[PDB]
Amino acid sequence: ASLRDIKTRINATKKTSQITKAMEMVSTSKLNRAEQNAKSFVPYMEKIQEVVANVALGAGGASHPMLVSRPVKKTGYLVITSDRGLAGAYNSNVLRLVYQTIQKRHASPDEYAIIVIGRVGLSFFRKRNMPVILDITRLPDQPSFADIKEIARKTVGLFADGTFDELYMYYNHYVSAIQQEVTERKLLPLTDLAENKQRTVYEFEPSQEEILDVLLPQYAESLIYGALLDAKASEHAARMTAMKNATDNANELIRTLTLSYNRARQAAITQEITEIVAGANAL
Amino acid sequence: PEIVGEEHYQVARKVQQTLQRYKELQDIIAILGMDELSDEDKLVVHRARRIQFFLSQNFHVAEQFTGQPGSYVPVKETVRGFKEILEGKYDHLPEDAFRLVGRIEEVVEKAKAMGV
Amino acid sequence: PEIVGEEHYQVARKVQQTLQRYKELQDIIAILGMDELSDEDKLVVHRARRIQFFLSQNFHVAEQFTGQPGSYVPVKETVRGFKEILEGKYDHLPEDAFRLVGRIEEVVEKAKAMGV
Amino acid sequence: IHVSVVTPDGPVYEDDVEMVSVKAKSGELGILPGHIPLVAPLEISAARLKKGGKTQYIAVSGGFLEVRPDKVTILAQAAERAEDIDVLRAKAAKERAERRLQSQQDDIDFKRAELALKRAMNRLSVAEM
Amino acid sequence: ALDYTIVVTASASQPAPLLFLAPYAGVAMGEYFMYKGKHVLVVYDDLSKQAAAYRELSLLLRRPPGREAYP
Amino acid sequence: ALDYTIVVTASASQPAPLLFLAPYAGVAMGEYFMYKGKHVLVVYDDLSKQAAAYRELSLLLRRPPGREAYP
Amino acid sequence: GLSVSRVGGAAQIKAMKKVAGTLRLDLAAYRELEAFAQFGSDLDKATQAKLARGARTVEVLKQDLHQPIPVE
Amino acid sequence: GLSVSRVGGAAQIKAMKKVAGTLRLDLAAYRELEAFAQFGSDLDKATQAKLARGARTVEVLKQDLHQPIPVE
Questions:
Q1: In whole angstroms, what is the distance from residue A16 CA to residue A253 CA?
Q2: Which positions are tagged coiled coil (chain A) (predicted)?
């Protein structure tokens, strides 16, 4: 069955297997660096969680607009997607769950606003004609704090103007390298909060209110950056798993095409030997 | 078009166009998967699975093979059926509901017997 | 180098290396553009275009079609010309004036005729 | 007892210093061991670590103070060590240019391999058995 | 099982003419009980060996072969 | 290098038996020094052409061909 | 792309040469750049305009059955 | 990788026999990874050292015509 075409198809799928194997190793190294970046972020997060728990859970503290739940006239959305493709069900699962949770319970384009992180989610919500009020893209593979910090302070200050009235986060939770679970984490109002099994009372140097006014935007920014690093780690792991599955599919195609190659090779040699011996019998 | 009709010809050639476009994507689907198609090729694959399964049909002869009694489909009925599939009317139904089914009313009753 | 000499072999091998390095960036230039490549590979495509247009001649038998008389270029002068392009002596001259000329003094004369 | 200055990027300066005099947004502060648990939002300024015989300046941007009687914890977002405040705004723009060229490089390193993979899949589509 | 079974054997060392006539010998033994009104099971272990043996015999008869050189 | 080598030539214009008999002349000139106790290197440039020449001679002599009409 | 005319150019009239010499370039650019639009991220605006010109080139080059068009 | 000498190993002096056995491994580790070396900072010392020693091994194993190098 056209032996040379089978041979060129074998060579082309071998080269696709080589490219996807190299992409798997690159994304494995990027997953290692993303796990190192998350482990670098860990102690700041546990300390800010300790301080916010011990302050906001003691001596009232529910007078701040970020603790108590105001009535809901709008709902913000912080969607964390990727800038680049070749991750399999990363962006599809996140954007599908965001689209389901928006179209399920609002049924009006003025009742929500969406803040995306990534070009894929941005193109998604511009194809679906949804508002993309805060829209930064082009993040590094191991992102630092300042580039997400400016959009995080704009998000918190856009809540503090009275616009969002609540918002949520959507990101892939990196558990171990194969699942990448989709999470809906409520960003703020900070109703869901828990003390660290033992508490010490604090002395507030300006007052409690000014300390909350400085601290709670920083806690929201730290939550956003922790979810963002966790989503980037799940991005590199999902691209690794997708390229590993691409190598496996390419190798299965290699072995079936070599079976068909051997069939066409045997058929070609028996055809040419029948032609030569028939021409010799002709004389 | 001069032998069969204009609308029959348009539906048949559009079915062949979507099936050829799905045939040209089987290497990308076989290696990289359904994940990297650019949201119109996903729609082509999604409608083309439904078309390739709705081409299949239960026979009166195959009642001795499976027990399903078999069907006879008029030409206007199957042209209306493939036109409704090409317009995207039945994108919400599962693709295994179209297997071995005469008409699209039978598609809908099989899909609500499945649970959709 | 036992037949053509050492200098001709080195200049020809370096012309082959820069034209083979240029026929690895073709998809990258065609898709991702010139602004994104590097300031080390755009020097490669710079000297590669200057070499690739200096490989063409005016012919004696093409004189009746264009009016240009045509040239017989010896081996020493074309080795000297490609060596001077590989060294970087003619990077300031434009992408044309290498087009359809015999020697490298004709490149200088045509680039002075273009105003540069 | 000891001070610990941390950052979301990573911990910066952990030592054994008994005197810190960081400026809060209300005003000056002074911390010796045995201090009460005190909480202060820090202004954009430098923290003075002057207990090892010589002072040690550490700048904070954003800035937040959590002093325990056991230890001192500073929650900062930018924690440059030269700590003459213009150097923080200079290093911010320097690392801004650094992360901008890094975000360009991490995109072109993806797109080159993606072009290789697209042409290699094109050869399968042209071969077509 | 040897109260009701018959074994017709033509092994690999036997020449291809006996391999060619082994299943026909089996069916000629089965037709007796078939046309006497009884029921017969006949098993052909590897008819591809019969195909290769008849392919051998036809090539030794110098008959022009088809695809996979079977006649 | 010509102080110790022997060059046996059968070019493409030469008839096919000289192409066929060039390597056998090579071993026949090497085995002299081999059985005199000396060490010999014999180099055969393109034995595939010697195979094609023997295929040519066997087909012109009407010997029964095998695969790719080589005898 | 694969089809060759080895007389070609001497066969065309003087209007058809002027008009089709860029038709071939636009269709060749579309055939070369369609290979990167099968999957992947996206392409930028310039070669997407090239792809739009090539899609309209393909839609021009289609005909119906037994309907020949004069050269003018 | 595809060339083999079935005698070889017994066709070497002991000085070449001590040394060429790891150059075989260096060429195996390089020709397996040279198709993977176009892009990416894969590993710090496990793959970049292999690619470096193999890319220098290829430059060692090059010669010119009519210059046989003595064995030592």
A1: 11
A2: none
| Gyration radius (Cα) of chain B, Å | 15
Q: How was this structure determined?
A: cryo-EM
Between the CA of residue E14 and those of E19, E20, E21, E22, E50, what are the distances in Å?
A: 7, 10, 12, 11, 12
Separation between Cα atoms, residue A190 and residue A218, nearest integer Å: 13
Q: Which of A221, A225, A179, A230 is nearest to A34 (CA)?
A: A230
Cα gap C109→C102, rounded to integer Å: 11
Residues of G in contact with D121 (CB under 8 A): 38-39
CB D10 within 8 A of CB A36: no
Q: How many CB atoms lie within 10 A of CB D36?
A: 10
The answer to whether D36 and D69 have CB atoms below 8 angstroms apart is yes
- Fold classification of D86-129 (topology level): 1.20.5
Residue A88 sits at the chain G interface (C-beta within 8 Å): no
CA dist F49 and F3 (Å) reads 28
Which long-range contacts link B81-86 to residues 24+ away (Cβ below 8 Å)?
B81/B54, B81/B107, B82/B11, B82/B12, B82/B15, B82/B51, B82/B54, B83/B7, B83/B11, B85/B47, B85/B50, B85/B51, B85/B54, B86/B11, B86/B14, B86/B15, B86/B18, B86/B47, B86/B51
User: CA–CA distance from C115 to each of C53, C68, C96, C102, C108 (Å)?
Assistant: 19, 20, 12, 20, 11
- Phi and psi at residue D80, in whole multiples of 5°? -65, 150
Q: Which residues of D touch G38 (CB under 8 A)?
A: 118, 121-122, 125
Of the candidates A162, A138, A142, the one whose C-alpha atom is nearest the C-alpha of residue A151 is A138
D45-49 and D56-60 as β-strands: parallel, antiparallel, unpaired?
antiparallel
> Is the dihedral angle over the CA atoms G15, G16, G21, G27 positive or is it negative?
positive
Q: State the chains in contact with E (3 or more Cβ–Cβ pairs under 8 Å).
A: A
Dihedral angle sign, alpha carbons of residues C100, C106, C110, C115:
positive
- Cite the annotated binding site of G for ATP by residue number: 5-6, 63-64
**Secondary structure of chain D in the HEC alphabet?**
CEEEEECCCCCCEECCCCCECCCECCCCCCECCCCCCEEECECCEEEEECCCCCCEEEEEECCCEEECCCEEEEECCECCCCCCCHHHHHHHHHHHHHHHHHHHHHHHHHHHHHHHHHHHHHHHHHHCC
Q: Does domain D1-85 have CATH number 3.40.47.10?
A: no
Give, as one character, the DSSP assignment of residue A134: B
Q: Which residue of D has its CA nearest to G35?
A: D122
Count of CA atoms in the C-beta half-sphere (13 A) of C60? 3
Catalytic site positions of G: 6
Tokens for F68? Answer: 């790719």
Phi first, then psi: give them for residue D34, nearest 5 degrees: 85, 15
Chain H nearest C-alpha distance from C75 (Å): 23
Structural tokens at position A70: 């105001």
Integer-rounded Cα radius of gyration of chain C: 15
CA dihedral A229, A149, D24, D93 (to 10 degrees): 110
Q: How far is CA A258 from the centre of its chain?
A: 38
Quoted resolution (Å): 3.0
Topology, domain A25-241:
Pyruvate Kinase; Chain: A, domain 1 (3.40.1380)
